[PDB]
Symmetry: C2
Subunit: 90 residues, 2 copies
């Protein structure tokens, strides 16, 4: 876990997390409710747009670039979803 590791989450149509790495777990435990709501909004937009959304989530003293991409194809445990990647730019 470093600012050089990206946070990754996979989320299915049911809004269940079906995969995550340590860095995503860490990011989620260390961000506030406003940032979480911003993230949720971006995820919801990606389900709708069905394309890639890329947004800055500027914190106080921290700066993340959040990418969310729509996935139509999942082997087991999902039909569709969104893959979230979070890069700490600071």
């Amino acid at each position: 876990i470093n600012s050089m590791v990206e946070g990754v989450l996979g989320i299915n149509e049911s809004r269940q997390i079906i995969l995550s790495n340590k860095m995503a777990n860490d990011i989620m435990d260390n961000i506030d409710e406003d940032a979480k709501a911003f993230l949720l909004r971006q995820i919801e937009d990606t389900f709708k747009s069905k394309q890639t959304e890329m947004r800055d989530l500027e914190m106080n003293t921290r700066f993340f670039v959040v990418t969310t991409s729509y996935i139509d194809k999942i082997e087991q445990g999902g039909k569709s979803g969104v893959v979230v990647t979070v890069r700490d730019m600071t």
Copy 2:
């Protein structure tokens, strides 16, 4: 006319999920397109980056040319990518040729 999306340039990254068995367990259409059109050397470079990520267990970023276009590939390690317990790598591929304006 003007609509809700007039100011949006519709961008798409390629996404692949790969388990311990080196099987693709998830993908989007753009990644499918990449894979259907990829040369053998580019495929080996992609595979190599994935292999390096299984080893490093952190995020790798590399430039990859495919059919003259400039891609940036990011690969990140996932300790448990599926419910059965396999680790994996999430691959995201960004088209930088599309980012640029040289085709105008």
